[model samples]
Target chain A: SLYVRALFDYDKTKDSGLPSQGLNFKFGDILHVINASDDEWWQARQVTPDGESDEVGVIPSKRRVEKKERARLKVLSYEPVNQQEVNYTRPVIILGPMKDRVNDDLISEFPDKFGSCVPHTTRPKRDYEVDGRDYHFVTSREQMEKDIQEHKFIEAGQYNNHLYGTSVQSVRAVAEKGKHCILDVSGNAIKRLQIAQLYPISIFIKPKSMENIMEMNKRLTDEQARKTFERAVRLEQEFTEHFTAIVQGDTLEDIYNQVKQIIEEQSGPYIWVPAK
Target chain B: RRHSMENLELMKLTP
Candidate 1:
């Protein structure tokens, strides 16, 4: 079943005397609408990054709409691209990172829906690295070269004397597991993926204002923050043509919420294609 | 108590 977003604030737990089947929801918060047939209240639970507790309850139906409906309204306001409904058939999302901690938190939060593709490398496996978990470690350059010759790689490049590439098989392996692979890579790599027809609906995580950045994580210096912000802007300029959505990494929660909404609204149900 | 219950029914009915 699809989700519905709250249009108004609701605090079901305000009164202690009320039934325990109550939840607090804010505007723009998403909920999984379970039973909407009831005239007074609808059964639903908050959609959390990690699953919410089993806190199903009745909410005022008038306060929310089917997530798709909101998505449709949003699509109308913007110049629509790939104007057909999106379905999640590709099962992989090529995510470009705007902020390291933000991306890490997002990936860590949604273990069920998101995963990163493991890359293949000719470098020897580090003591701390697992073969498949980190990189598909290779013993020799010749072996990697052979794989490259046989058309096994979607994108490959050499760096620091190590042959590194994301193999076609590795991406397929991620897709086959019914999870979307978040491949953070360069424009050249994206071009190769597009040629392979595996270039996913891309989401560019644009940087947030300096104030918000400091508020989210206090450790970042102004210089580091400005550099990251600048990098995100340049990345957008260089690759805007390839992006399906440009999400502002404002608050971590806000960015995550927006990304989730984009994924659901853009990717149509069952078929897994972008919304037309 | 009776008036409060009546008001509750009225509020539910008003919407």
Candidate 2:
């Protein structure tokens, strides 16, 4: 980001007999900066602005002001800098469980169809599951302990009092495959996870309504209804406490756009569009 | 304040 510069060539100004104040640089003209001590003209590199109160006021400088510097900088030709690159891939929107009825079978059914997140676990190898393909099954309690020591799990919780954890690498591996990985993680870990840095992009999947959930779950079996209600309740509580916003809409497109809008507004340079 | 990037070529510039 090159900032424009203006130079006050006072000698030249005096020579031309131009007004001192009017000699300032024109609006929107790009300029270069020079180190006053070196007197060598340099490019005005775009530096991050400090947000402190002191940053706002114009401080009286013994050195030439920016306007004068800009004039000098213009005499020395330089190129205007380009904006930073954007990541164009569809963001990894994590549609985890809002209702307790969200199970492994349900998680497995997510992805490619719905923006569902299949979480990783340390459960014993199921009959038809493969390592890394199904879930990253590791050896020993010690190994899991060591990974814990290494800060592996993004979120860990007890389900039916059995331990379940989603590892950071598990999500990364999915992302490395050039697809966004969404996960149903505990509310405890949502704050700790840096969405932009850890995952490609994260949209916390929130259920739009509980009244509709209760209405919809009424058809389920007693056990199913209980499970669904609990999951939805847990998700709602976490969402209310954790996220900056609650995302929900009547249609999938509307919900998807709202999530996309949230991500776009939060960060930068890419627009999320649904696949055809 | 006069701000300038002072390069210490030979001097070990440490505060």
Candidate 3:
């Protein structure tokens, strides 16, 4: 999408023959030009500090100036950079049991290489958790759900009765900085990531056994731990068809090594383009 | 002195 700076004050009126245009902007306000190719009126969404408007309506193209004359147009032509096609190492998404443990280990080992994709959640933040680092804690599920309808999230899942979602914006937070965004996501979310072409290298980390899982996670009861490991095994079996690697998490170091190898194998030349 | 020297050695070890 291209950005255009509004050159004049625009107000929507019922009698103006285009009443549905949802925003009123003063001069110098930016409208993200969604459809500028139309000769008469551009279908654009108003950009705001909080978030961009979901409403798209007709605006006179003459009233706004292109943010960048040449480069803005070029952006629309390049195929989106995904992990497989990029020059730098793609983000590695480790899904399955002990995902957080494995992710923490990998980041600690590589230090400068791997960064975590902090997901947005409707669940309230804990006392120890900081915003953005732990999760982008939204005010309510309704707000996140509204954004979801607007295609803000690449994938969303419900856990422990709360909505957790990964936004395209958050993923870019890591990727835009030239670091790989390590994602710990569900199989459902991985499927959506595949479609969005934010190219993720998926690794399924299956626990060695339910007995081992019970031994590691003491916070859960034996039955609860068994169920959690069972869930991971089910996800591994169901989604292994799409995974680049299926690793057994018998030892954290062994699992980390396998994941590191897979990421190295996928790393290649990627072009970084500056946004206009 | 030995403990201080061990601390320096620990810091020197790299992953």
Candidate 4:
């Protein structure tokens, strides 16, 4: 029996957001742990005159032993998308905290209404709005005072305008619901989350190529669906580097199923536990 | 009522 001993660490900085934290190893990832105490060896592999000499001598000083063990990877199962073919219901996928196209949407009646991210403003509600569910509205003066107190917000340009902000608590609240909070934030958000030791399995949903997107547009039956798909493709083209894995189909169904399988498997925290 | 009358059973399947 080959038994080996080795040390492994999940360095957060090194996480590629792939399976096994990009270690690419699942439960069956081969882990060779070698016990370096059994193999017969002298103080050195060879004799040294109290310094450095590599020669064969069997009877004189010390001995070392070693053993090895490994686990092979085995993919068992994966999650699938929900009925709407919109999102995965099993494992949550975190996205967003990038640029705000909300203003762009505000001007146009029809925004990218699919996974459309509306800006969270602190302005008072319109009569038709609901609190918490709608944009978080707080007193401007009070918010500015708090901003000054905390020295957190960059108040250089918005000297006279209402100090609009996104709070960490707001993001955490969404996450608490077992739903991933796709924060339409600055690139700084990624670094901030990294510093905070928050492991958000980031997957930038991108669009198919211009050719594929044109094909997608041609195939989409609904006007809204086509627009949504087009918007997603555009975002992907704009930010190709952050993508984990792109969907493998020309239809909404393919994209949905792709997300489903990946998240449902070992990626999710709750589904499978120790079989014993 | 119909479901129960038809011998309803909770079956858990693992893949």
lDDT of 3 by residue, A1-276 (tens): 566545334666632555345456654345677766754456778765346788887775552323323446541111111112453345678888777787778788877888867777777987987997777899887897887777677666666566666787788677767787887555655655555556666777767787767655657787888788889877865765456456665566677777777666545453211232
Q: Top model by TM-score, which number?
A: 1
How would you class the docking of model 3? incorrect
Residue A238 alpha-carbon offset, candidate 3, angstroms: 2.5
Leading candidate by DockQ:
3
User: For all the predictions, what are the DockQ values?
Assistant: 0.01, 0.01, 0.02, 0.01
| lDDT for each residue of candidate 2 in A60-91, tens digit (9 for 90 to 100) | 12233444446664322222333233443222
Clashing pairs in 3: A87-A268, A87-A269, A87-A270
Clashes of 3: 3
Model 2 spans > 4 angstroms off: A1-129, A157-163, A199-210, A215-244, A250-276, B1-15
Query: Reference contacts recovered by each candidate, as fractions?
Result: 0.00, 0.00, 0.00, 0.00
By lDDT, the candidates rank as: 3, 1, 2, 4
Q: Note each model's CA RMSD in angstroms.
A: 18.5, 19.4, 20.9, 19.9
Report the lDDT of model 2 for residue B9. 14
After TM-score superposition, what is the CA distance of residue A205 in candidate 2 from its true location, in Å?
A: 6.3
The local lDDT score (0 to 100) that residue A96 gets in candidate 3 is 80
The positional error of residue A240 in candidate 3, measured at the CA in angstroms, is 1.9
Candidate 3 chain A has its poorest 10 consecutive residues by lDDT at A75-84
Give chain A TM for each model in order: 0.57, 0.44, 0.54, 0.41
